[PDB]
Design a protein around this ligand. Structure first.
Ligand SMILES: [Ca+2]
Length: 88
């Protein structure tokens, strides 16, 4: 339980702040006060990444459990935690 959550807790103030901060900045007019695979994209490449529009939907579809493809202040710190071991 709480597999990625325990990881988002070991993050650094530079990561938690950049997340919520970049989120609100990218949530401006977002689909629903959040950043779904369609909004997180431009928000992910800015954190130091460059995935594709195809793996994006599948990425959340794996961590998400509602079938919405949205990532508010929660699935963002979780989906980014898996990318830490997906490239290592
Ligand atoms: Ca979701």
């Amino acid at each position: 339980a709480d597999i990625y959550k325990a990881a988002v807790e070991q993050l650094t103030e530079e990561q938690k702040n950049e997340f919520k901060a970049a989120f609100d900045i990218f949530v401006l007019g977002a689909e629903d006060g959040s950043i779904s695979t369609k909004e997180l994209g431009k928000v992910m490449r800015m954190l130091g990444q460059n995935p594709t529009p195809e793996e994006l939907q599948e990425m959340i579809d794996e961590v998400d459990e509602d079938g919405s493809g949205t990532v508010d202040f929660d699935e963002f710190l979780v989906m980014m935690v898996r990318s830490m071991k997906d490239d290592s």
